[PDB]
Curated annotation (Swiss-Prot):
Changing residue 187 to G: Reduction in N-acetylglucosamine and UDP-galactose binding. It comes from the Eukaryota. The gene is B4GALT1. Ubiquitously expressed, but at very low levels in fetal and adult brain. UDP-alpha-D-galactose binds at residues 63-67, 102-104, 129-130, 190. The chain holds residues 126 to 398 of 398 of the full protein. Pathway: Protein modification; protein glycosylation. It comes from Homo sapiens (Human). This is Beta-1,4-galactosyltransferase 1. The soluble form derives from the membrane forms by proteolytic processing. Homodimer; and heterodimer with alpha-lactalbumin to form lactose synthase. Interacts (via N-terminal cytoplasmic domain) with UBE2Q1 (via N-terminus); the interaction is direct.
Length: 272
């Protein structure tokens, strides 16, 4: 029964999962030690299983500005989890240059476009830097419908704020992201950019996929009021095809590959 053969696909669910994880933010983190403990993660925060081929080619995109301590917690907790999930992944921290109003959604678009320059990713996880999953059965990859990952956050009493809530951590396949023309680029702190994304998905006929809530629990790292759903549905229908990936503009000022992540510092302009 000999002969040259290809590596098998990785299994539907990884056999390496441990389930519940104790998440704490009260100790210091040293990235050199983290890299040493995660020796298989390559420069820029890249990893793929050695013994099987994952159909999950995932770019994990983190919107960022001055949250280095949270990032250190994110990297310390997520790298082991992502490897146990057997993903072919890369970590991208999209750092907003300057001191002007933060624009989360626009940095996420930047992440999608820049991660694609690196590799043919086919799934995109958009994750705030201060959310850590509490159970490794909460898969950080894409499904048949847009995936809402952080479904039961401790900050919201472990309950979904409203059925259309799509914030925190989500995953969209390349096909799913393209068909909604990405995310809006003009939410300069206004709030509700996640509701606009949800409206785009719905208008394109997509629904929300979610892990079972018991394994979808996440911890939020406190830093220096349950959200409510912002309207603007008509707005989204009016503007989604003209404001998004197609109209995205920015300047890349610095690209740094660190052992555990790639950081792209970009100038995304100011509110027009
Ligand atoms: O100065 C800032 C503001 C926001 N963020 C990123 O944006 C996410 C959400 O921002 P915030 O924690 O203020 O939550 P919001 O209330 O705006 O949902 C954070 O977790 C970070 O990933 C950041 O990096 N720096
Ligand atoms: Mn936060």
């Amino acid at each position: 029964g000999r002969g040259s053969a290809s590596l098998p696909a990785c299994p539907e669910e990884s056999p390496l999962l441990v389930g519940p994880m104790l998440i704490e933010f009260n100790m210091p983190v040293d990235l050199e030690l983290v890299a040493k403990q995660n020796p298989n993660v390559k420069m820029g925060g890249r990893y793929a299983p050695r013994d099987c081929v994952s159909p999950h080619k995932v770019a994990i995109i983190i919107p960022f500005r001055n949250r280095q301590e949270h990032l250190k917690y994110w990297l310390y907790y997520l790298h082991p989890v992502l490897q146990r999930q057997q993903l072919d992944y890369g970590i991208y921290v999209i750092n907003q240059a300057g001191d002007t109003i933060f624009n989360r959604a626009k940095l996420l678009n930047v992440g999608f476009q820049e991660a694609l320059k690196d590799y043919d990713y086919t799934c995109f996880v958009f994750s705030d830097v201060d959310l850590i999953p509490m159970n490794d059965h909460n898969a950080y990859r894409c499904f048949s419908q847009p995936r809402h990952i952080s479904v039961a956050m401790d900050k919201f009493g472990f309950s979904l704020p409203y059925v259309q809530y799509f914030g925190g951590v989500s995953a969209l396949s390349k096909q799913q992201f393209l068909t909604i023309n990405g995310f809006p680029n003009n939410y300069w702190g206004w709030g509700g950019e996640d509701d606009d994304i949800f409206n785009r998905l719905v208008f394109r006929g997509m629904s929300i996929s979610r892990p079972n809530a018991v394994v979808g629990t996440t911890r939020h790292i406190r830093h220096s009021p349950n959200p409510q759903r912002f309207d603007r549905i008509a707005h989204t229908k009016e503007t989604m095809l003209s404001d998004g990936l197609n109209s995205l503009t920015y300047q890349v000022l610095d690209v740094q590959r660190y052992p555990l992540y790639t950081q792209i510092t970009v100038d995304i302009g100011t509110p027009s």
